[PDB]
Structures are given as C-alpha cells and as structure tokens.
Amino acid sequence: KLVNAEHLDALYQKVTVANKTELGLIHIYSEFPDYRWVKDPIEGVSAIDDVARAAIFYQRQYQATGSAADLEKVKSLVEFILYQRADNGYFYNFIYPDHSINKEYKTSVAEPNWWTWRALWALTQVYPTLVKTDNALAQRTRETIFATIDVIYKDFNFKQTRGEKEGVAVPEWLPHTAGDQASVLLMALSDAQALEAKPEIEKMMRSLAAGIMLMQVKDTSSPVNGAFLSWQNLWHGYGNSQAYALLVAGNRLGDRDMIKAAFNELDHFHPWLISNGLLNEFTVRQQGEKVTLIEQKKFSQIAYIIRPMVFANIKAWEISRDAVYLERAVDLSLWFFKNNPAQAQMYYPVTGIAFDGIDSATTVNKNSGAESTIEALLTLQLIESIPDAKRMLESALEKRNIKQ
Template identity: 35%
Template sequence: MALFACAAPQGAVPPSPHADAASSARPITLAHFDHLFAEANVGGERVGVVNIYSTAPDFAFAIEPREGYACVDDVARAIVLLAAEPQPDARRLRQIELMTRFVVRMQAENGYFHNFIWAGGRINREYRTSLSELNWWSLRALWGLEAALLRLPEGSQTAARARAAANRVVGNLKRDLPVDRRGLETVEGVQVPTWLPFGAGGDAASTAILGLVPHYQRTRDAGTRALVERLGDGLVQMQAGDARTFPHGAHLSWRNQWHGWGNAQAYALLRAGAALNRRDFTASALREVDLFYPHLLKHGMLSSFALRAKDGRIETSEVQRFPQIAYGISPMVLAATEAYRQTGQARYRDTARRLGAWLSGANDAGRPVYDPASGRVYDGINGPGSMNPDSGAESTIEGLFVLRALDGVPLP
C-alpha cells in the first residue's frame, strides 16, 4: 500500500527545481543511518548505539559536552525503525539485538533508564537529561523494547532481558501514574488534566501509550490496559478548538501549549482506539487529522503556540513558525497514514502525502529535507529559505519514519 505520491499542497512554498515532489516511487536508503550506527562497550558488554550529532559538510560526529554522544532516546527510535521492516535481513536483526542490549544496559536500579553515554561507554548518571526517572527516554525505551521483542528470537537471552526490562518499567508507570488519579487545573483559563506525565504532558503521554499498547497486546495485562485508557482519557481532555475555532481539534502538548515536536497524541489515540476498541479515542484523533492538519497545510506549518481563555474566547499567543523539524512532521504523517489504514478513506492518504511533501521541498525553505542518495534527513528549517544542513540521529530516524509510513509500512 504505497502512499507516497508527493504533490505539493496548495498554498505551500513550491519545491526547488531539484525536489522530486511528484515522484510516486520514493527510494528509501539507510546509508546515513548506518553511518550513524556504531558498536560500543557499555558495562563490559558489546552493544549498538547511534551517534546523536552529525555535522555538515563532512557529517563528522560531535559530543554534547554535558550529555554525551549517544542516547537511549535515539537508540529506542532506531529499534522501532528497523523492527518495522517487513523482512529485516541478518544485518538489521544484528543491529536490533545490539541496540536492545544497550537499552537494557541503561536501565537503572529504580527501573527507569539513564539516557546518555560518554565516549568509552561510561554512563552519564548525573546530568538532568540523563537521570533515571519517568521522562521521555524511559518512555521511549519501553516502545523500543516492545518493538525489539517482535524481532528477537523468543528464547534468546536478549529477548528475556528485554521482556524483564519492559515489564519492570511498566510496573513503575502503574505506580507513578495511578489510574485512579483525577483532577483538572486551569492554566491561562484553559482546563487541562493533572494525571498525565509531568502533570499535563500530553506529548509524553502519547509516547507512553505507544509503548504500553504493544505491551498490553503482548501480555493482556488488565493493569496495563487500564493505564492506557486513563492516559487516553487525558489526551482527549487536552483537545482544543473545533471546525470554526483555532486550533481546530489539535491536542495540546503540555498545559496550555502546543509544539510540533513529539506531538503524537492523534497517532497514539488511533493506536489505542484500535487496540482497545475505544471509539472515543479514534474519534478524537480523527478530529485532529480532519481539521488541524488541513489548516496547517493551507496556512503554513507551525513550530509552537499557546492558548489562553479571555472574556469567554480562546486566544492564541506565543506563535512560532520555526524551527520546523522532521520530528514535528512525522507524528502527523503517522497519524494520517494510520487513519487511512483504519478507515480506508482516501482523504487521509492524501493528507499524509501532502504532509510528507515537506521532506521533498514543499516547505518554507523551498529545498528537500531528505536526500535519497545519501539517506540524510537534514536537521530542519530555520526560517524562510534557510535550512540546517546537519543530519543527526533524531532527524534521520524521524524522517525515515515518515518515508516508511508513506510506503504503507506500519510501525510496531
């Protein structure tokens, strides 16, 4: 079910002469991913990692001085990417196994995960973005582990370790996100739930659901199902606007704010709705795809905004158009392709194609963000006519998510 036939959306910046925006056969190469992939030793064990930063023009690697050079957040994404391949070959299966070993190695005694490693394989246990806590990297680790279990030999030691690590972090989530928690708070006049990660983190909750749904499908654990439903209830509560009122059904990311990166609420609700037969989740997700995405395609992509209620009306503030990154496009394409998969309605396929055209040049820079010859996905658009020429792990993997989805390949 190939979906990619990238006609540029009406009103979008026309692609450059080199952008293949009308191609119906979109080549996908993992050459740059393989450039980013490396083997390392962590805790005396051979593991697989993905270099975070790759800087133009020679795409050499870099180390963030407070964090390190590789992280669970990107390695877990990479596992999902490779596990999505319909028939991964021996090389890809080996990469999945090595990266699974890395994620398992990064699990701390408390059941959550450290995120970064330094050169030499030393785990960064001190910096705030590498603490073992309920945070993005621990939630992404769960998604990656569950994806790996679809490809690892069931009786292997690595699979057993992955199952134990996934089960342990789910136990933490049941404890730290109790399903009986209730409550709303008002932020700038906007009511938001208090039982999601970070209080009102719809974005983080969507990542949690993407790991919890396959965990439930694997274990049929009633507690996991209850947690997915409670998080889904919170995401529905975070939806704002309607056909006439901005933001036209978008699910807010955190408190009264929306940002493009990681805004996978609609995609997560579609996955949860199908797995749990929750039609309200599905309906909420489709409202965002039906209303908000066409608005962006018509009026231009956004990076972030905030809402506030004043005098009985919802006002928009702090609107930012840039930067635009693959991590902001991929959640929308994943949601639109999943909507097409579940409903068979052509308008969702067309929405996905139009959103995906951002990669091939239908964007504010007027330049392709994906290079099919090298497999690089560049690190985003800084402003009109301006593109970041670097190509790091997050952009590369999220861009490849888009291409896989448009090729009709679902993520695990």
C-alpha cells in the same frame, strides 16, 4: 529506493564494554560538510532518546527485508537500551565518550522522562521480532517491559485533578502534564497489552487517554479546532503523537471515543496546518468555550513534526479506507522535498542525509543528527510500505526539481 539508511548506518557504532557486552550506539550529532560523529560536549555521544527510535526503524527494515544486518542492529541497540536500565526501574539516557553512563545530568537521570517512554515503546515494538530470532534477548526484553510497567504503575497518579492556564484545563496526572509524552507511554502500554493483558495496563491506558483528550481543542469557531495541546496552553508539532496513540489504543481497547477524538484532529487541524505551511508551536487562551490563538511560531520546523502526523494519517486510512488521509500523509511527506517555507530539500535519498531543521524562510540547518535522520527515515519507511502511498509520493516527486 527513497529510504536510504546509509547516513544512519554511519552514525551507528558497536562498542564493547566490560565482559563481552556489545552495545549499539547512535551518535547524536553529525555536522555539515563532513558528516562525522559529533557529540554533545556536556551530555555525551549517544542517547536512548535516539537509540530507541533507531531500534524501531531497523526492526521495521528487518520486517520488510529480512536482512541479517538489520537484525544485528536491532539486537545491539536493544542491548544498549537494557544497559541503561537503572536499579529503580527507570532508564538513564546518555552514554559518555569513555562509555561510562551519564547518571546525574538533568537530561539523563533515571527518573520518569521522555527517554523512559521511548525506551519502553522501542522494547514493545521489537519484542515480537526478538522472540522469533533470539530467545535469551527476548526473555530479557519481556522481563524488562513488564518490570518497567510495574514501576510506572506503582508511581502512577490516578487522581484526576485539573489546573488551568489561560483558561485551558491542565491534567495534573499526566507525566509532566505533557500530552506528547503521554502519547508515547500510551502507545507502549497498548503494545504491551497485546503481549500480556493486565487490568492495570488498561487502567493506565484509559487514564492517559483521558488526560490527552482533556487537552484537545474542541471549539468549532477556532482556527485550531481539533488540535491536541502538548503542555498547558501550548501546542508544539514535534513528538505530538496524541492522535496516532489514540488510534492505536482505541483499536486495542475497542474504544470509539478515542478514535473519534483522533479523527477530530485529523479532519480539522491537519488541513489547517497544511494550508498554512505548518507551525513550530502556538499558545491559546480559552474564554468559556471560545479558544483563541495568543502567539504562534512558524520556525524552527524539524522532521519530528512530520512523522507523528504522517503516522496518524496512515493509521486513519487503514481504519477508515478514506483516501484523503493517504493524500494528506503524502502531502506532509513533501516537506522533505521542498514543500516548506525555505523551498528546501530536507532529505536526500542518494545519501540518506536528513537536514536538522528550517530556521527561517532563508536559513536551513544542514547538519544531520540522529533524531532528524531517524524521523525522516521512519516517515518515508511507512509511506513506502503502503503501495498506494508509495505510488502517490513517487508521482509527486517525478514532477519536481529534487535530487534523488
């Protein structure tokens, strides 16, 4: 009842190219008040960054409901992902309005980047669904998963050298030295390891987790004790799925250290964030063992901050059976329902609209692009799948002045 795919469905478009190749697109932007399709004028109409996450949403919907229409969307979004595979084994990101591929723009080249990791994660997430339903598409997907992993393995830097920024160690072997990108590649590799275990996949998993863990703040005197930094000495909330990824990988490998590191973020940094109304980003300085805040930015706040935290807390509950994590997951979900600095409703169950962000205490961006819609839907979809969390969120919503 909370989850309403009507706006995401309106961003979806099936296009035919070449010889009966049917591609599922998700239009990237959509603007208040008419909420039609809006493009990026330079980059194109739809990106793997969004299509990949949409594929996961619709696959999870199909798993919950068995709806033939959800499955059809999974298949066509997967076709777009496969359509974007480059000869070198990486992926292009954008498609243009004329349905040619954006191969050369910096946000779209087939080089290791965010959209590679998201594409791979989407393919590993939807493969078990495809193998039960569509033999030919499943075979192509499996071939692509492990061919892409081959390429990533061939290019992988296992030499664990460290830089430094404001006293903080930098793992030079992570992609773009980015803990957030590393977490999604780690999630994808963990899924693939369950499909076909390979020593080189475990080796990459452990190397990524080592880099992610080196970037964690471990200073019990620091306000942001437990935080997984995103890049150098910087944390940003968006896409920061390190804790969730370490829980997934730690479970896959039986690695207690990974699990312990993830809980350290959940048990210290998450309650701090929640108590302070969330943040967009911050930077730190490290002097010896002491980690201190340099600067922080409360805005902008976007749906993509909430989803990684809700994913991690639900997973923590599943592992530990501690209800505090469900309570926190629900309290974080309330960001969509006016628990935020603008006291603004950010997701509308009646229409499926998800606002694009909070820019200050008094300014809300009422556009509803693909990313914010998918991230709100994935968050609420997870809550509604856990009966105790669903019951808790419904109880919180009956008491407040939201539109539903």
